[PDB]
C-alpha cells in the first residue's frame, strides 16, 4: 500500500499570506491525489481533485500542483475561515490511502486571557463532591499556565484542563481547568484561587473567592 506523508504537522501563517501544504507519496501516483479540509468537529470537504482540478463551490484561492511523488496544496491570501486540518488522499493504487494531516494555525496579535472562577454549585455539593472551574477566555498564543491555590497552598494532582481548538472567527484559544475536591475537604478551607500566567500578562492574574462569603 502507498504511504502519504504530510509534513510538517502544523503550519502557522499570518493572515493574507500564501501557504503551501506538502504531501509526498511512497511511490509514484501520477496525479491521482485529492485534498480535503476538515474544520473542527466537521466532516472532510473536498477541495481539489486529481492534483490540480477545481471543485464546485471552493474558493479560487485554493489550488494544487505536483506529479509523481511530490505534491502541494496552496491557499492564496489565507483567512480565518481556513483554520482547519488538511488531508491528502491517493488513489492510483488500491486501497485508497490518506495522509495524517497538517493543521493550519493563523497568527494574530498577543491577547491575554480573560479569567473567571466558578465555585461549585449548591446542587453538586449535595452529592458529596465539589468542582471548582477556572476559565481562561480568548487568548493567544496557545501556551498558558493555571495554578490552583487553596488557602494560598499550591494544589497538585487534583485538577484537569482542556483547551479548545483555534477559533475560526478571532484566532484565539480558550482553556478550562477543573479542581475536584470532596465536599468535606472543600468545606475545610476558605480561599479558592486560580493563578494564570500567559505571554500577554506581565504579572500573574489571580481570580479567587471565599467560600460562603
Amino acid at each position: 500500500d502507498i504511504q502519504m506523508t504530510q509534513s510538517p504537522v502544523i503550519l502557522s501563517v499570518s493572515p493574507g499570506e500564501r501557504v503551501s501544504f506538502s504531501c509526498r507519496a511512497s511511490q509514484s501516483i501520477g496525479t491521482n491525489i485529492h485534498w480535503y479540509q476538515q474544520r473542527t468537529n466537521g466532516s472532510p470537504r473536498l477541495l481539489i481533485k486529481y492534483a490540480s482540478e477545481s471543485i464546485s463551490g471552493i474558493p479560487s484561492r485554493f489550488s494544487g500542483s505536483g506529479s509523481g511523488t511530490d505534491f502541494t496544496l496552496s491557499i492564496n491570501s489565507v483567512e480565518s475561515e481556513d483554520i482547519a486540518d488538511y488531508y491528502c488522499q491517493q488513489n492510483n493504487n488500491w486501497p485508497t490511502t490518506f495522509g495524517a494531516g497538517t493543521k493550519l494555525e493563523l497568527k494574530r496579535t498577543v491577547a491575554a486571557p480573560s479569567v473567571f472562577i466558578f465555585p461549585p454549585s449548591d446542587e453538586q455539593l449535595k452529592s458529596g463532591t465539589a468542582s471548582v472551574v477556572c476559565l481562561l477566555n480568548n487568548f493567544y498564543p496557545r501556551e498558558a499556565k493555571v495554578q490552583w491555590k487553596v488557602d494560598n497552598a499550591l494544589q497538585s494532582g487534583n485538577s484537569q484542563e482542556s483547551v479548545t481548538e483555534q477559533d475560526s472567527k478571532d484566532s484565539t484559544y480558550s482553556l478550562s481547568s477543573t479542581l475536584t475536591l470532596s465536599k468535606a475537604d472543600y468545606e475545610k478551607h476558605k480561599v479558592y484561587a486560580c493563578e494564570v500566567t500567559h505571554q500577554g500578562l506581565s504579572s500573574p492574574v489571580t481570580k479567587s473567592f471565599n467560600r460562603g462569603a
Binding site: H34, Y50, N91, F98, S162, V163
Partner: protein
C-alpha cells in the same frame, strides 16, 4: 442537494459488533457506490470498503473477515456492520459518496458516528450550573456555563437556548477522569446588562444513555 445522514453514536463491548445506517437523499443508491471511512487519533483516516451501485462490495484487506455492507435501495439506506470489535476500532465512522459512480473523489460525507469499544457501561451525565458572578464581570461582559460531569462514552452535544445562542459559546474537549468517566464544561460570554432579563439554558444530549438534560443557569441572589 446530496445529503448523507448517519445513525447515532454508541458503545460496543470488545468482541461485539457495530451497526451503522447511512440514509442518503438527492441521488439513488442504484446509481452510486457508497464508501465507508473511519478516523481515529491513532490511525488517522482509513478507507474501509464500498458497496457499489449493483450490490457488489469491496472490503479493505484488514477487514475482509469481519465487515459486511449491504443496503436497501428502495429506502435509500446503506448498512455498515463490523464484527469482533477491539479497542483499536474506536473511531468516528463516516459514509461518503464520490463525484462519479465509479470513483473515489469523496465530495459528499455523512456527519460521522462515534463508536466506542470498551468493556465499561454507559452512564449519562450530571449537569451543574456555572453561575455568572458579580465580582467576575469584566467590562460589560459576564461569563456563565454548565459543567457536564461523569458520563460514558463520548460524545455529548451541548447547545445553549436550544440553538438560539451560538455567539461566544465554547464547549471544551472532554477530559477522562481517573474514574474512567468523562467530564466537560461549556461556557458563554454575554452582556452583563442582560443578566436580569435574559434566560440562559444549556441543553446536554447524551445519545448512548438516551438522556437529554436542560439546566437553567441563573445569577445567585
Amino acid at each position: 442537494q446530496v445529503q448523507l445522514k448517519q445513525s447515532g453514536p454508541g458503545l460496543v463491548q470488545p468482541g461485539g459488533s457495530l451497526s451503522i445506517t447511512c440514509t442518503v437523499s438527492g441521488f439513488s443508491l442504484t446509481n452510486y457506490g457508497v464508501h465507508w471511512v473511519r478516523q481515529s487519533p491513532g490511525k488517522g483516516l482509513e478507507w474501509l470498503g464500498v458497496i457499489w451501485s449493483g450490490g457488489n462490495t469491496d472490503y479493505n484487506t484488514p477487514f475482509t473477515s469481519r465487515l459486511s455492507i449491504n443496503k436497501d435501495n428502495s429506502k435509500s439506506q446503506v448498512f455498515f456492520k463490523m464484527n469482533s470489535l477491539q479497542s483499536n476500532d474506536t473511531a468516528i465512522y463516516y459514509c461518503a459518496r464520490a463525484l462519479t459512480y465509479y470513483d473515489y473523489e469523496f465530495a459528499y460525507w455523512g456527519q460521522g458516528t462515534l463508536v466506542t469499544v470498551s468493556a465499561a457501561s454507559t452512564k449519562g451525565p450530571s449537569v451543574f450550573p456555572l453561575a455568572p458572578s458579580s465580582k467576575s464581570t469584566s467590562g460589560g461582559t459576564a461569563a456563565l456555563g454548565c459543567l457536564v460531569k461523569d458520563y460514558f462514552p463520548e460524545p455529548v452535544t451541548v447547545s445553549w437556548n436550544s440553538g438560539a445562542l451560538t455567539s461566544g459559546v465554547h464547549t471544551f474537549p472532554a477530559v477522562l477522569q481517573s474514574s474512567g468517566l468523562y467530564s466537560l464544561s461549556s461556557v458563554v460570554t454575554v452582556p452583563s446588562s442582560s443578566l436580569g432579563t435574559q434566560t440562559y439554558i444549556c441543553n446536554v444530549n447524551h445519545k448512548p444513555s438516551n438522556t437529554k438534560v436542560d439546566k437553567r443557569v441563573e445569577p445567585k441572589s
